[PDB]
Amino acid sequence: KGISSSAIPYSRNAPAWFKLSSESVIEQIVKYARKGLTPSQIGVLLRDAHGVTQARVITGNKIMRILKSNGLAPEIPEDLYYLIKKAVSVRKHLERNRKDKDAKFRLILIESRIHRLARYYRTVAVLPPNWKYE
Amino acid sequence: SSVLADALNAINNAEKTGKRQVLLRPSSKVIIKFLQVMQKHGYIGEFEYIDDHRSGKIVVQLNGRLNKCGVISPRFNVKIGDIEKWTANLLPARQFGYVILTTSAGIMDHEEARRKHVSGKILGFVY
Amino acid sequence: MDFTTDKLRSMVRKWQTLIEANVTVKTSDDYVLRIFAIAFTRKQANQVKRHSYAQSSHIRAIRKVISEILTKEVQGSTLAQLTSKLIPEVINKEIENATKDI
RNA sequence: UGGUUCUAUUUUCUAGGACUGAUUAAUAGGGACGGUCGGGGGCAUCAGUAUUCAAUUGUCAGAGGUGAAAUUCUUGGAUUUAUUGAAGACUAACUACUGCGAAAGCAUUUGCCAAGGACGUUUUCAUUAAUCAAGAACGACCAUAAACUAUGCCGACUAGGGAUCGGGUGGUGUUUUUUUAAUGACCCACUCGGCACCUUACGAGAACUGGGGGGAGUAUGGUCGCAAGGCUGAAACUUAAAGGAA
């Protein structure tokens, strides 16, 4: 295990060089989401190019709440969606060539990780119960 | 592990190794009250709560006077009539150290608890 | 053309990497030649660490430019031109100049 | 998206009504991104020289092999030499108290397929987490070896030191170099994470199944065994030949 994460500043204010509007950021957010990017991609594009540090600080609330209150909710949370599509990519690799025992092992690991947070999201009922991973 | 237990573990073995400062993270109200009662009885010196916005850090300065902290992991209820018995069974000696309790009136040691006549659940000990 | 075995045994030392490449190239005649190449990773002057290994992506990039520029030296030569090119060891100088960037 | 009517100049601007309402952001965990990293895996491709076999020469009497020999091959040319082809393996030196993998393990090139880790992150979710009984994954033909001298004090535990592998930041010199793209190598300091090594300080560290009782010896009027005699022939026979012994 390694310690490599992001270090959120002690400040909770806009950084006083951020001369943009607190609403034009939201309009850019919903524009990028409607052209089709995941919320982590919205956050990293907004951070890199239109220099909002983080939008829970600069806007009102966090950007998945912004997308759900502006009508662009996800069908399934981003974590579960990315782990689902990684699992189905490994599954198509396994149907293609069937002597990859290591990739079978990594499929068992990815499927366990699917079930863990699918169980969490189900008891929170973000997604409905009787959800199965096909 | 717990959050009071690893703080008291750091404050124990750092003093065994002979350091004059511990940094313990994270920090809760119960940790502040536990260090509060043990500096009220003179086992640690000053301590400081650095507030980062996550959970808080404590830098304790401690001289030599502690020799064991601990927590009693089932928080069983004790009575005012059995404070003396529980001190007899878990303390080193008769008047050596203090059992620390969570009471109605907050975190207190056993002798303050029976002084102002209130029982509670056990938390931990210091001697 | 071939080295003697004692030459490349005299070149191989531990604590470096040997990058070796080979290409099967057809010349400006219709001779087709399998032509090889060896190279050993130097250490710079002032280098104090004893290793001077290449990071294997530098090996893939060095082997890539070795293959490209020596298949450029063939196809642009006949057999007589290639022989007169590799007598005074100058394709080695072309490899060295093209690879000291890596 | 639908509908009703109110103000001054043939078309200008207007007002109203029906289809959300608690925190952080763990030197906890997950997910995304970025440049990468590795002898991690799978498929395909490429190469290398040995070995074995074969074809063609050249030459002639031996060649293996062993401590000596022998089985074996050989004037129907063995072994040696040269050219070439085919086969099945294998990846030499580089090769390390290095790397990667959950372990068993993994070393030629190039490409494809998915994967993984560390780092960077003012990205995202927000407790989704840790340990393991149970259970699951990996581990009629041609016939095979494994261990075998070893080591060490343990954990909830403090600091270090040198060297090395992967990433990052900064410095500002040399190799680099230029108006085709981006991209190095080394030196130094810091920092994160690894494989090890050399030390330090401080703690109860208690509460593929079947087992007699120490080590080195000694004695034996017990029990169970094995063992002597005495020239063979040769005993009911004083007995041949032949052999042994001296």
Coordinates of C-alpha atoms (C1' of nucleotides) in Angstrom, one line a residue:
Chain A
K1 CA 0.0 0.0 0.0
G2 CA 1.2 3.4 -0.9
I3 CA 0.3 6.9 0.2
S4 CA -0.4 8.8 -3.1
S5 CA -3.5 10.9 -2.8
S6 CA -4.4 14.6 -3.2
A7 CA -3.9 17.1 -0.4
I8 CA -7.0 19.3 -0.1
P9 CA -6.0 22.8 1.2
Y10 CA -7.0 24.1 4.6
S11 CA -8.8 27.0 2.9
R12 CA -12.5 26.6 2.0
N13 CA -12.7 29.9 0.0
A14 CA -12.4 30.7 -3.6
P15 CA -8.6 31.5 -4.0
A16 CA -9.2 35.3 -4.6
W17 CA -7.8 35.1 -8.1
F18 CA -10.8 33.2 -9.2
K19 CA -12.7 36.0 -10.9
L20 CA -15.2 33.8 -12.7
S21 CA -18.9 33.4 -11.7
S22 CA -20.3 30.8 -9.4
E23 CA -23.0 30.1 -12.0
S24 CA -20.9 30.0 -15.2
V25 CA -19.0 27.2 -13.6
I26 CA -22.3 25.3 -13.2
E27 CA -23.2 26.0 -16.8
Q28 CA -19.9 24.7 -18.0
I29 CA -20.4 21.6 -15.8
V30 CA -23.8 20.8 -17.2
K31 CA -22.5 21.5 -20.7
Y32 CA -19.6 19.0 -20.3
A33 CA -21.9 16.5 -18.7
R34 CA -24.5 16.7 -21.5
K35 CA -21.7 16.3 -24.1
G36 CA -21.0 13.2 -22.2
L37 CA -18.2 13.0 -19.6
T38 CA -18.1 11.3 -16.2
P39 CA -18.0 13.5 -13.1
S40 CA -14.3 12.8 -12.4
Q41 CA -13.6 14.0 -16.0
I42 CA -15.7 17.1 -15.4
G43 CA -13.7 17.8 -12.3
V44 CA -10.3 17.3 -13.9
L45 CA -11.2 19.3 -17.0
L46 CA -12.6 22.2 -14.9
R47 CA -9.5 22.1 -12.7
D48 CA -7.1 22.0 -15.5
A49 CA -8.5 24.5 -18.0
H50 CA -11.0 26.9 -16.3
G51 CA -9.2 27.1 -13.1
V52 CA -11.7 26.2 -10.4
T53 CA -9.7 24.4 -7.7
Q54 CA -12.6 22.3 -6.6
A55 CA -16.2 22.9 -7.2
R56 CA -17.5 22.0 -3.7
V57 CA -15.5 25.0 -2.6
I58 CA -16.2 27.3 -5.5
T59 CA -19.8 26.4 -6.3
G60 CA -22.3 25.5 -3.6
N61 CA -22.1 21.7 -3.5
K62 CA -20.3 18.8 -5.1
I63 CA -20.7 18.2 -8.7
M64 CA -22.7 14.9 -8.6
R65 CA -25.2 16.9 -6.6
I66 CA -25.0 19.6 -9.3
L67 CA -25.6 17.1 -12.0
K68 CA -28.5 15.4 -10.2
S69 CA -30.1 18.8 -9.5
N70 CA -29.6 19.9 -13.1
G71 CA -31.1 16.6 -14.5
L72 CA -28.0 14.7 -15.7
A73 CA -28.0 11.9 -13.1
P74 CA -26.0 8.7 -13.8
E75 CA -27.8 5.4 -14.4
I76 CA -25.2 3.7 -12.1
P77 CA -22.5 5.3 -9.9
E78 CA -19.1 6.0 -11.6
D79 CA -17.2 3.5 -9.5
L80 CA -19.6 0.7 -10.3
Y81 CA -19.7 1.6 -13.9
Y82 CA -16.0 1.6 -14.4
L83 CA -15.5 -1.6 -12.5
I84 CA -18.4 -3.2 -14.5
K85 CA -16.8 -2.2 -17.9
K86 CA -13.4 -3.4 -16.8
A87 CA -14.9 -6.8 -15.7
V88 CA -16.7 -7.1 -19.1
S89 CA -13.5 -6.2 -20.9
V90 CA -11.6 -9.0 -19.1
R91 CA -14.6 -11.3 -19.8
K92 CA -14.3 -10.7 -23.5
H93 CA -10.6 -11.2 -23.4
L94 CA -11.2 -14.5 -21.7
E95 CA -13.7 -15.7 -24.3
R96 CA -11.2 -14.7 -27.0
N97 CA -8.2 -16.6 -25.5
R98 CA -8.8 -19.3 -22.9
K99 CA -5.3 -20.1 -21.6
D100 CA -4.9 -16.8 -19.6
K101 CA -5.2 -18.2 -16.1
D102 CA -3.8 -14.9 -14.7
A103 CA -6.6 -13.0 -16.3
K104 CA -9.0 -15.5 -14.9
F105 CA -7.6 -14.7 -11.5
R106 CA -7.9 -11.0 -12.0
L107 CA -11.5 -11.5 -13.1
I108 CA -12.2 -13.2 -9.7
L109 CA -10.7 -10.2 -8.0
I110 CA -12.6 -7.6 -10.1
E111 CA -15.9 -9.5 -9.6
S112 CA -15.3 -9.6 -5.8
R113 CA -14.7 -5.9 -5.9
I114 CA -17.9 -5.5 -7.9
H115 CA -20.0 -7.4 -5.3
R116 CA -18.5 -5.4 -2.4
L117 CA -19.6 -1.9 -3.4
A118 CA -22.7 -3.2 -5.2
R119 CA -23.7 -4.5 -1.8
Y120 CA -22.9 -1.1 -0.3
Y121 CA -24.9 0.8 -2.9
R122 CA -27.8 -1.6 -2.6
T123 CA -28.1 -1.2 1.2
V124 CA -27.9 2.6 0.7
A125 CA -30.3 2.0 -2.2
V126 CA -28.7 4.3 -4.6
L127 CA -29.4 1.7 -7.3
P128 CA -32.5 -0.5 -6.9
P129 CA -32.4 -3.9 -5.2
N130 CA -32.7 -7.0 -7.4
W131 CA -29.6 -5.7 -9.3
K132 CA -27.3 -8.5 -10.3
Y133 CA -24.4 -7.8 -12.6
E134 CA -26.0 -9.8 -15.4
Chain B
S1 CA -8.2 -1.2 16.3
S2 CA -10.0 1.5 18.2
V3 CA -9.4 5.3 18.0
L4 CA -8.7 5.8 21.8
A5 CA -6.7 2.6 22.0
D6 CA -4.1 3.5 19.3
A7 CA -3.7 7.0 20.7
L8 CA -3.1 5.6 24.2
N9 CA -0.8 3.0 22.6
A10 CA 1.3 5.8 21.0
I11 CA 1.3 7.8 24.2
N12 CA 2.4 4.6 26.1
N13 CA 5.2 3.3 24.0
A14 CA 6.5 6.7 23.0
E15 CA 7.0 7.4 26.7
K16 CA 8.6 4.0 27.2
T17 CA 11.1 4.8 24.4
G18 CA 11.7 8.1 26.2
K19 CA 10.4 10.7 23.9
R20 CA 9.3 14.1 25.2
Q21 CA 6.5 14.5 22.6
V22 CA 3.9 12.3 20.9
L23 CA 1.9 13.2 17.8
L24 CA -1.3 11.2 17.9
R25 CA -3.9 11.2 15.1
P26 CA -6.9 11.3 14.8
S27 CA -8.3 13.1 17.8
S28 CA -11.8 13.0 19.3
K29 CA -13.6 14.5 22.2
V30 CA -13.1 11.4 24.3
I31 CA -9.3 11.6 23.6
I32 CA -9.4 15.2 24.7
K33 CA -11.2 14.3 27.9
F34 CA -8.9 11.4 28.6
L35 CA -5.8 13.5 28.2
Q36 CA -7.6 16.2 30.3
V37 CA -8.1 14.0 33.3
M38 CA -4.6 12.5 33.1
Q39 CA -3.1 16.0 33.0
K40 CA -5.4 17.0 35.9
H41 CA -3.7 14.3 37.9
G42 CA -0.3 15.2 36.5
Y43 CA 0.7 12.4 34.1
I44 CA 1.3 14.6 31.0
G45 CA 2.3 18.2 30.5
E46 CA 0.6 20.5 28.0
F47 CA -1.0 19.2 24.9
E48 CA -2.1 21.0 21.7
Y49 CA -4.9 20.2 19.3
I50 CA -3.8 21.2 15.8
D51 CA -7.0 21.4 13.8
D52 CA -6.6 20.3 10.3
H53 CA -10.0 20.1 8.7
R54 CA -9.9 16.3 8.6
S55 CA -10.0 15.1 12.2
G56 CA -7.4 16.8 14.3
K57 CA -3.9 16.1 15.7
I58 CA -2.7 16.2 19.3
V59 CA 0.9 17.0 20.3
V60 CA 1.2 15.9 23.9
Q61 CA 4.3 16.7 25.9
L62 CA 4.9 14.2 28.6
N63 CA 7.8 14.2 31.1
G64 CA 8.2 10.9 32.9
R65 CA 5.4 10.3 35.2
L66 CA 3.2 7.9 33.2
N67 CA 3.8 4.2 33.1
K68 CA 0.7 2.6 31.6
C69 CA -2.4 3.9 29.8
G70 CA -5.2 1.6 28.7
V71 CA -8.8 1.0 27.7
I72 CA -11.2 -1.5 29.1
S73 CA -12.7 -2.9 25.9
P74 CA -16.2 -3.9 27.1
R75 CA -17.6 -0.7 28.5
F76 CA -19.4 -2.4 31.3
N77 CA -21.3 -0.3 33.8
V78 CA -19.9 0.1 37.3
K79 CA -21.6 1.3 40.4
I80 CA -20.6 3.8 43.1
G81 CA -20.4 0.9 45.5
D82 CA -18.2 -1.2 43.2
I83 CA -15.8 1.6 42.1
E84 CA -13.6 0.5 45.1
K85 CA -13.8 -3.1 44.0
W86 CA -12.9 -2.4 40.4
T87 CA -10.0 -0.2 41.3
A88 CA -8.8 -3.0 43.6
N89 CA -9.0 -5.6 40.9
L90 CA -7.4 -3.6 38.0
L91 CA -5.1 -1.0 39.6
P92 CA -1.6 -1.8 40.7
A93 CA -2.1 -1.0 44.3
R94 CA -4.5 0.6 46.8
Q95 CA -4.1 4.3 46.0
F96 CA -2.0 3.9 42.8
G97 CA -3.5 5.3 39.7
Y98 CA -7.0 6.1 38.6
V99 CA -9.8 4.3 36.7
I100 CA -11.4 6.7 34.3
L101 CA -15.1 6.5 33.6
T102 CA -17.7 7.9 31.2
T103 CA -20.5 9.1 33.5
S104 CA -23.6 11.2 33.4
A105 CA -21.3 14.2 34.2
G106 CA -18.8 13.4 31.6
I107 CA -15.4 11.7 31.6
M108 CA -14.0 11.6 35.1
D109 CA -11.7 9.5 37.2
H110 CA -13.1 7.0 39.7
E111 CA -12.3 9.1 42.8
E112 CA -13.9 12.2 41.3
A113 CA -16.9 10.1 40.3
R114 CA -17.4 8.7 43.7
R115 CA -16.6 12.2 45.2
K116 CA -19.6 13.8 43.5
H117 CA -21.5 10.5 43.7
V118 CA -22.1 9.4 40.1
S119 CA -21.5 6.1 38.5
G120 CA -21.0 5.2 34.8
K121 CA -19.4 3.0 32.3
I122 CA -15.7 2.2 32.5
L123 CA -13.4 3.7 29.9
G124 CA -9.8 3.1 30.8
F125 CA -7.1 3.5 33.4
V126 CA -4.0 5.3 34.1
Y127 CA -1.3 4.9 36.7
Chain C
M1 CA 31.2 -11.1 -42.2
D2 CA 31.7 -12.3 -38.7
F3 CA 33.5 -11.4 -35.6
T4 CA 35.8 -13.8 -33.8
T5 CA 34.3 -15.1 -30.6
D6 CA 37.1 -13.6 -28.5
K7 CA 36.2 -10.1 -29.6
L8 CA 32.6 -10.1 -28.3
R9 CA 33.7 -12.1 -25.2
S10 CA 36.2 -9.3 -24.7
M11 CA 33.5 -6.8 -25.0
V12 CA 30.9 -8.3 -22.7
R13 CA 31.2 -7.0 -19.1
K14 CA 28.7 -7.2 -16.3
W15 CA 27.0 -4.0 -14.9
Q16 CA 25.9 -2.8 -18.3
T17 CA 23.3 -3.9 -20.9
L18 CA 24.0 -5.3 -24.3
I19 CA 21.4 -4.1 -26.9
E20 CA 21.6 -6.3 -29.9
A21 CA 19.5 -6.0 -33.0
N22 CA 19.2 -7.6 -36.4
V23 CA 17.4 -6.8 -39.7
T24 CA 16.7 -8.8 -42.8
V25 CA 17.1 -6.2 -45.6
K26 CA 17.2 -6.6 -49.4
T27 CA 19.8 -4.3 -51.0
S28 CA 19.7 -2.3 -54.3
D29 CA 20.7 -5.6 -55.9
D30 CA 18.5 -8.6 -55.1
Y31 CA 20.8 -9.9 -52.4
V32 CA 18.9 -10.2 -49.1
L33 CA 21.1 -10.0 -46.0
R34 CA 20.5 -10.7 -42.4
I35 CA 22.7 -8.0 -40.7
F36 CA 23.3 -7.9 -37.0
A37 CA 24.3 -5.2 -34.5
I38 CA 25.6 -5.2 -31.0
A39 CA 26.0 -2.2 -28.6
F40 CA 26.9 -1.9 -24.9
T41 CA 25.6 0.7 -22.5
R42 CA 28.4 3.0 -21.4
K43 CA 28.7 5.0 -18.2
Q44 CA 29.3 8.7 -18.5
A45 CA 32.4 10.4 -17.1
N46 CA 31.5 11.8 -13.6
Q47 CA 29.0 8.9 -13.2
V48 CA 29.5 7.5 -9.6
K49 CA 26.8 4.8 -9.5
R50 CA 28.3 1.5 -10.7
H51 CA 25.5 0.3 -12.8
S52 CA 24.7 2.3 -16.0
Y53 CA 21.8 0.1 -17.0
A54 CA 19.3 1.1 -19.6
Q55 CA 15.7 1.2 -18.6
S56 CA 14.5 -1.2 -21.4
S57 CA 12.4 1.4 -23.0
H58 CA 15.6 3.1 -23.8
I59 CA 16.6 -0.4 -25.1
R60 CA 13.5 -0.6 -27.3
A61 CA 14.1 3.0 -28.6
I62 CA 17.8 2.4 -29.2
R63 CA 17.0 -0.9 -31.0
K64 CA 14.4 0.9 -33.0
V65 CA 16.8 3.5 -34.2
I66 CA 19.4 0.9 -34.9
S67 CA 17.1 -1.1 -37.1
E68 CA 15.8 2.1 -38.9
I69 CA 19.2 3.6 -39.7
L70 CA 20.9 0.5 -40.7
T71 CA 18.1 -0.5 -42.9
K72 CA 18.5 3.0 -44.3
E73 CA 22.2 2.2 -44.8
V74 CA 21.2 -0.9 -46.7
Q75 CA 18.8 0.0 -49.6
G76 CA 21.0 2.8 -50.6
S77 CA 23.9 0.5 -51.1
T78 CA 24.8 -2.4 -53.4
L79 CA 27.0 -5.3 -52.0
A80 CA 30.1 -3.5 -53.1
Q81 CA 29.0 -0.2 -51.7
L82 CA 27.9 -1.9 -48.4
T83 CA 31.2 -3.7 -48.2
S84 CA 33.2 -0.5 -48.8
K85 CA 30.9 1.1 -46.2
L86 CA 31.5 -1.5 -43.5
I87 CA 35.3 -1.8 -44.0
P88 CA 36.1 1.6 -42.2
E89 CA 33.5 0.9 -39.5
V90 CA 31.4 4.0 -40.3
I91 CA 27.9 2.5 -39.9
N92 CA 29.0 2.2 -36.2
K93 CA 29.7 5.9 -36.1
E94 CA 26.3 6.5 -37.7
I95 CA 24.7 4.4 -34.9
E96 CA 26.7 6.2 -32.2
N97 CA 25.8 9.7 -33.5
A98 CA 22.1 8.7 -33.9
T99 CA 21.9 7.1 -30.5
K100 CA 23.7 9.5 -28.1
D101 CA 20.4 11.3 -27.7
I102 CA 19.1 8.3 -25.7
Chain D
rU1 C1' -45.0 22.5 -24.2
rG2 C1' -49.9 24.7 -24.1
rG3 C1' -53.3 28.8 -23.1
rU4 C1' -55.8 33.8 -21.3
rU5 C1' -55.8 39.2 -21.6
rC6 C1' -53.2 44.6 -20.4
rU7 C1' -50.3 49.8 -22.9
rA8 C1' -48.8 53.6 -25.9
rU9 C1' -47.0 54.2 -31.5
rU10 C1' -50.0 49.3 -41.1
rU11 C1' -46.5 46.1 -36.9
rU12 C1' -43.3 47.4 -32.0
rC13 C1' -42.4 46.3 -26.7
rU14 C1' -44.8 43.9 -22.4
rA15 C1' -47.4 41.4 -16.8
rG16 C1' -49.1 36.9 -14.5
rG17 C1' -50.6 31.2 -14.1
rA18 C1' -49.6 24.6 -14.7
rC19 C1' -47.2 20.3 -16.4
rU20 C1' -36.3 18.9 -4.2
rG21 C1' -35.1 20.8 1.8
rA22 C1' -27.4 19.5 6.8
rU23 C1' -20.9 18.3 7.8
rU24 C1' -16.0 16.5 6.9
rA25 C1' -13.2 14.5 3.2
rA26 C1' -9.2 9.8 7.5
rU27 C1' -0.4 9.9 6.1
rA28 C1' -9.1 4.5 6.1
rG29 C1' -11.1 2.3 1.5
rG30 C1' -12.7 2.5 -3.8
rG31 C1' -12.9 4.7 -8.7
rA32 C1' -11.1 8.1 -12.8
rC33 C1' -7.0 10.6 -15.2
rG34 C1' -1.5 11.4 -16.6
rG35 C1' 3.5 10.1 -18.0
rU36 C1' 5.2 5.8 -17.3
rC37 C1' 7.4 0.8 -15.2
rG38 C1' 8.4 -4.7 -15.4
rG39 C1' 12.5 -11.3 -17.7
rG40 C1' 3.6 -10.5 -14.9
rG41 C1' 0.1 -13.3 -18.5
rG42 C1' -2.2 -14.9 -23.5
rC43 C1' -1.8 -15.1 -28.9
rA44 C1' 1.0 -14.3 -33.2
rU45 C1' 5.7 -13.2 -35.3
rC46 C1' 11.1 -13.0 -35.6
rA47 C1' 16.1 -14.5 -34.6
rG48 C1' 20.3 -17.1 -32.6
rU49 C1' 24.0 -20.8 -32.3
rA50 C1' 24.5 -25.6 -30.4
rU51 C1' 22.6 -30.8 -30.8
rU52 C1' 20.5 -34.8 -33.7
rC53 C1' 19.6 -36.5 -38.6
rA54 C1' 20.2 -36.2 -43.9
rA55 C1' 22.4 -34.8 -48.8
rU56 C1' 26.9 -33.4 -51.3
rU57 C1' 32.3 -32.9 -51.5
rG58 C1' 37.7 -33.7 -49.5
rU59 C1' 40.9 -37.3 -47.2
rC60 C1' 42.0 -42.1 -45.1
rA61 C1' 41.8 -46.0 -40.5
rG62 C1' 40.4 -45.5 -36.9
rA63 C1' 36.4 -42.8 -33.8
rG64 C1' 33.6 -42.9 -29.0
rG65 C1' 34.2 -43.8 -24.1
rU66 C1' 36.7 -44.9 -19.6
rG67 C1' 40.8 -44.9 -13.8
rA68 C1' 41.7 -48.6 -17.4
rA69 C1' 38.3 -51.3 -20.7
rA70 C1' 33.9 -52.9 -23.1
rU71 C1' 28.8 -52.6 -25.6
rU72 C1' 28.6 -49.2 -30.3
rC73 C1' 30.1 -47.0 -35.3
rU74 C1' 33.6 -47.9 -39.2
rU75 C1' 37.3 -49.0 -46.4
rG76 C1' 28.8 -50.1 -48.3
rG77 C1' 34.3 -44.4 -45.7
rA78 C1' 33.4 -43.9 -39.2
rU79 C1' 35.6 -39.6 -36.6
rU80 C1' 37.6 -34.7 -38.7
rU81 C1' 36.7 -30.5 -42.5
rA82 C1' 33.5 -27.5 -46.0
rU83 C1' 28.5 -26.1 -48.1
rU84 C1' 23.3 -26.8 -47.4
rG85 C1' 18.6 -28.6 -45.6
rA86 C1' 15.2 -30.7 -41.8
rA87 C1' 13.6 -31.5 -36.8
rG88 C1' 12.6 -30.8 -31.7
rA89 C1' 14.0 -28.0 -27.8
rC90 C1' 16.4 -23.9 -25.5
rU91 C1' 17.0 -18.6 -24.9
rA92 C1' 24.3 -18.6 -23.4
rA93 C1' 27.6 -14.5 -21.8
rC94 C1' 24.7 -9.5 -20.4
rU95 C1' 22.5 -12.0 -15.1
rA96 C1' 22.8 -8.8 -9.8
rC97 C1' 22.0 -10.6 -2.3
rU98 C1' 18.5 -6.7 -9.2
rG99 C1' 13.1 -6.6 -11.5
rC100 C1' 7.9 -8.6 -12.0
rG101 C1' 4.0 -11.9 -10.3
rA102 C1' -1.1 -14.0 -5.1
rA103 C1' 2.1 -18.3 -4.9
rA104 C1' 4.0 -22.2 -8.0
rG105 C1' 7.1 -19.0 -11.1
rC106 C1' 8.9 -15.6 -15.3
rA107 C1' 14.9 -14.0 -19.5
rU108 C1' 15.5 -13.6 -28.0
rU109 C1' 12.9 -9.5 -31.4
rU110 C1' 8.4 -7.2 -33.0
rG111 C1' 3.1 -6.5 -32.8
rC112 C1' -1.8 -7.2 -30.8
rC113 C1' -5.0 -8.4 -26.5
rA114 C1' -6.6 -7.3 -21.8
rA115 C1' -4.2 -6.7 -16.8
rG116 C1' -1.3 -4.8 -12.6
rG117 C1' 1.8 -1.8 -9.3
rA118 C1' 4.3 2.6 -7.5
rC119 C1' 4.3 7.8 -8.2
rG120 C1' 1.7 12.7 -9.6
rU121 C1' -3.2 14.9 -8.6
rU122 C1' -6.4 22.0 -5.4
rU123 C1' -10.3 14.8 -9.8
rU124 C1' -14.6 11.8 -7.9
rC125 C1' -17.7 8.6 -4.3
rA126 C1' -18.3 9.0 0.9
rU127 C1' -17.4 4.6 5.4
rU128 C1' -18.3 1.8 1.0
rA129 C1' -13.7 -1.0 5.8
rA130 C1' -9.8 -5.5 8.7
rU131 C1' -9.3 -10.7 9.9
rC132 C1' -10.0 -15.7 8.9
rA133 C1' -13.2 -21.8 10.3
rA134 C1' -16.7 -23.4 5.7
rG135 C1' -16.6 -22.8 0.2
rA136 C1' -14.1 -21.2 -4.6
rA137 C1' -9.8 -20.1 -8.1
rC138 C1' -4.4 -21.0 -9.2
rG139 C1' -0.9 -24.6 -7.9
rA140 C1' -4.7 -48.5 -25.8
rC141 C1' 0.6 -45.6 -26.4
rC142 C1' 6.9 -43.0 -24.9
rA143 C1' 8.4 -43.0 -19.0
rU144 C1' 10.1 -39.8 -15.0
rA145 C1' 12.9 -38.1 -8.2
rA146 C1' 12.3 -35.3 -3.9
rA147 C1' 15.3 -34.3 0.5
rC148 C1' 20.5 -34.8 2.4
rU149 C1' 23.6 -29.6 7.7
rA150 C1' 20.5 -25.8 8.4
rU151 C1' 19.5 -20.7 12.2
rG152 C1' 17.0 -17.0 13.7
rC153 C1' 14.2 -14.3 19.2
rC154 C1' 9.4 -12.8 18.6
rG155 C1' 5.8 -7.9 18.1
rA156 C1' 1.3 -3.8 18.9
rC157 C1' 7.9 -1.5 18.4
rU158 C1' 11.9 3.9 18.1
rA159 C1' 15.2 5.9 15.2
rG160 C1' 18.7 5.7 11.7
rG161 C1' 23.2 4.4 7.7
rG162 C1' 25.1 2.9 3.0
rA163 C1' 23.8 0.9 -1.6
rU164 C1' 19.9 -0.3 -5.3
rC165 C1' 14.9 -0.4 -8.3
rG166 C1' 10.3 2.6 -10.0
rG167 C1' 8.0 7.6 -9.8
rG168 C1' 8.1 12.9 -8.6
rU169 C1' 10.1 18.0 -7.4
rG170 C1' 14.2 21.5 -7.4
rG171 C1' 19.3 22.9 -8.6
rU172 C1' 22.7 24.1 -12.6
rG173 C1' 27.3 21.8 -15.2
rU174 C1' 28.8 18.1 -18.6
rU175 C1' 27.4 14.8 -22.3
rU176 C1' 23.2 16.1 -25.6
rU177 C1' 21.8 19.7 -29.5
rU178 C1' 19.8 23.3 -34.6
rU179 C1' 12.8 25.6 -37.2
rU180 C1' 10.2 18.1 -38.3
rA181 C1' 7.3 15.7 -33.6
rA182 C1' 8.2 14.9 -28.5
rU183 C1' 12.0 12.5 -25.8
rG184 C1' 17.1 11.6 -23.1
rA185 C1' 22.1 10.1 -20.0
rC186 C1' 24.9 11.7 -15.7
rC187 C1' 25.8 14.7 -10.9
rC188 C1' 23.4 16.7 -6.2
rA189 C1' 19.6 17.6 -2.5
rC190 C1' 14.7 16.4 -1.0
rU191 C1' 10.4 13.0 -1.1
rC192 C1' 7.0 8.6 -1.8
rG193 C1' 6.8 3.3 -2.5
rG194 C1' 9.7 -1.5 -3.0
rC195 C1' 13.7 -6.2 -2.7
rA196 C1' 17.4 -6.8 0.7
rC197 C1' 21.5 -5.7 4.1
rC198 C1' 24.0 -3.3 8.7
rU199 C1' 22.8 -1.5 13.2
rU200 C1' 20.0 0.8 17.4
rA201 C1' 15.5 1.6 21.9
rC202 C1' 11.4 -0.8 24.1
rG203 C1' 7.5 -4.1 25.1
rA204 C1' 4.5 -9.8 28.7
rG205 C1' 5.4 -12.1 24.4
rA206 C1' 1.4 -15.4 29.7
rA207 C1' -4.2 -16.5 30.7
rC208 C1' -0.4 -34.8 5.5
rU209 C1' -3.1 -38.6 11.5
rG210 C1' -1.1 -42.5 14.8
rG211 C1' 3.9 -40.7 20.2
rG212 C1' 7.2 -42.4 24.7
rG213 C1' 10.3 -39.7 27.8
rG214 C1' 16.7 -37.2 28.5
rG215 C1' 22.1 -38.0 26.8
rA216 C1' 26.3 -41.2 27.4
rG217 C1' 27.2 -45.9 29.1
rU218 C1' 27.8 -50.8 32.4
rA219 C1' 26.3 -55.5 34.4
rU220 C1' 23.1 -59.9 33.5
rG221 C1' 22.4 -67.6 37.2
rG222 C1' 15.6 -64.1 34.0
rU223 C1' 12.8 -65.1 28.8
rC224 C1' 13.2 -65.6 23.4
rG225 C1' 16.6 -66.7 19.7
rC226 C1' 21.3 -67.5 16.6
rA227 C1' 25.6 -70.0 17.2
rA228 C1' 30.4 -75.0 18.9
rG229 C1' 32.1 -80.0 17.8
rG230 C1' 35.3 -82.2 14.6
rC231 C1' 39.5 -84.5 8.3
rU232 C1' 35.4 -85.3 4.2
rG233 C1' 33.9 -89.6 1.5
rA234 C1' 31.9 -92.9 5.8
rA235 C1' 27.4 -95.6 8.0
rA236 C1' 24.1 -100.5 9.8
rC237 C1' 30.2 -101.3 7.1
rU238 C1' 37.1 -99.0 11.1
rU239 C1' 35.3 -99.2 3.8
rA240 C1' 37.4 -97.7 -2.2
rA241 C1' 38.8 -93.7 -5.5
rA242 C1' 39.8 -88.7 -5.0
rG243 C1' 40.5 -84.3 -2.2
rG244 C1' 42.2 -81.5 2.2
rA245 C1' 45.9 -80.5 5.9
rA246 C1' 50.8 -80.7 7.5

